[PDB]
Structure formats: structure tokens, C-alpha cells
Amino acid sequence: DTGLLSGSEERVQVALEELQDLKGVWSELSKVWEQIDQMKEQPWVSVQP
Amino acid sequence: DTGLLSGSEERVQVALEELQDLKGVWSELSKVWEQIDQMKEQPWVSVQPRKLRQNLDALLNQLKSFPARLRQYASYEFVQRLLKGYMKINMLVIELKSEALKDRHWKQLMKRLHVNWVVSELTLGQIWDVDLQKNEAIVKDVLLV
Numbered sequence: 349d350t351g352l353l354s355g356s357e358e359r360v361q362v363a364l365e366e367l368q369d370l371k372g373v374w375s376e377l378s379k380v381w382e383q384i385d386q387m388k389e390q391p392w393v394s395v396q397p
Numbered sequence: 398d399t400g401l402l403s404g405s406e407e408r409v410q411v412a413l414e415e416l417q418d419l420k421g422v423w424s425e426l427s428k429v430w431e432q433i434d435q436m437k438e439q440p441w442v443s444v445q446p447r448k449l450r451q452n453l454d455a456l457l458n459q460l461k462s463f464p465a466r467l468r469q470y471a472s473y474e475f476v477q478r479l480l481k482g483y484m485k486i487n488m489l490v491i492e493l494k495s496e497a498l499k500d501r502h503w504k505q506l507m508k509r510l511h512v513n514w515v516v517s518e519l520t521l522g523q524i525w526d527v528d529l530q531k532n533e534a535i536v537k538d539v540l541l542v
Contacts, residue, residue: 390442390443391442391443392442393442394440394441394442394517394518394519394520395440395442395518396517396518397517
């Protein structure tokens with residue numbers, strides 16, 4: 349038994365929290381990406397501004 | 398004792414079953430005319446006449462999937478004869494992606510059809526509202542010229 353590396357523990361914690369944050373970010377960004385891709389797939393020449 | 402006319406409540410429950418059947422019928426009809434609404438409000442920006450045939454046959458087959466009681470109803474007859482009688486955007490609307498389409502072409506076609514347009518939104522909604530099967534001759538004359 350010895351002094352455990354609390355730096356590793358806080359690294360794991362910050363990795364987990366930033367991971368959940370970035371997963372929510374990726375969900376939002378994927379929604380934005382799919383909607384803008386669907387919108388741009390059409391020429392949109394006669395669809396009102 | 399109050400011997401009551403139970404035939405009244407039998408008619409109530411039979412009307413209830415017919416009511417639920419009609420509710421299902423009109424839910425399907427709401428989907429049918431909603432699909433018609435999306436093919437309605439389209440500005441003919443990207444839609445293909447073979448896509449028009451695809452939508453027509455899709456509507457026809459999902460309609461024909463009605464059960465016997467749902468299929469025999471007068472509303473089913475109405476929507477089916479609608480689909481058949483309109484079984485023609487893919488026939489005429491090849492003028493609007495053609496090169497012959499132009500500004501004074503729009504002016505002459507507007508005079509022929511007598512309805513007014515804004516150039517920005519070329520929604521085929523009001524195009525279908527001006528029945529091509531009704532104004533067959535004048536629009537095909539416009540095609541010829």
C-alpha cells in the first residue's frame with residue numbers, strides 16, 4: 349500500500365466529464381450537420397428565402 | 398321494470414364501431430392528402446417526373462391496402478378515383494425545366510392561365526390549383542409555341 353496517484357484519478361474524472369460534454373456536443377453538431385446537408389442537397393433555387 | 402328499447406343502444410354501439418372504422422379511414426386519408434400536400438407545396442426545384450410516378454403508385458398501393466370495410470367506403474372510392482383521374486404533372490410540367498421557359502414565356506402562360514404569380518416562389522401548388530387536365534389545350538399551345 350502506498351500513496352495513490354490522485355493526479356491519475358483527477359485525469360480520469362476530467363476525461364469523463366469532458367467526454368460527456370463532447371458527446372453532447374457531437375450529438376448537437378451531428379444534428380446541425382444532417383439538417384444543413386439535407387437543406388443543401390436541394391438546389392433551393394425557387395424556395396423562398 | 399322499465400323495459401327499455403335496447404335497440405337504441407345496439408345502434409349506439411354499431412355506430413361506435415363504424416365511427417372507429419371511419420376514424421381509421423380518415424387517419425389514412427389524412428396521411429394520403431398530407432403526402433399530397435408535400436407534393437403540392439413543392440416548387441418543382443428537384444422533383445423528377447419519374448418521382449411523380451413513384452409518389453402516385455406509392456399512394457395507390459398504400460390506399461389499396463385498405464381492409465374490405467375500409468376499402469368499400471365512399472371516401473375510399475373518392476380518393477381512388479382522384480388518384481386515377483389524376484394518373485399529369487409528369488406529362489405537362491416538362492416545360493418548366495426546359496430551356497424554352499423564359500420571362501415573356503411566363504407572361505404569355507400567365508395570360509393564358511389568367512392567374513397571377515410571383516417569380517421568386519415558383520410553387521407548383523397554384524400550378525396544380527390551375528388544373529392542367531382542365532387547361533390542357535391552352536398550356537399545350539404554349540408548349541407548341
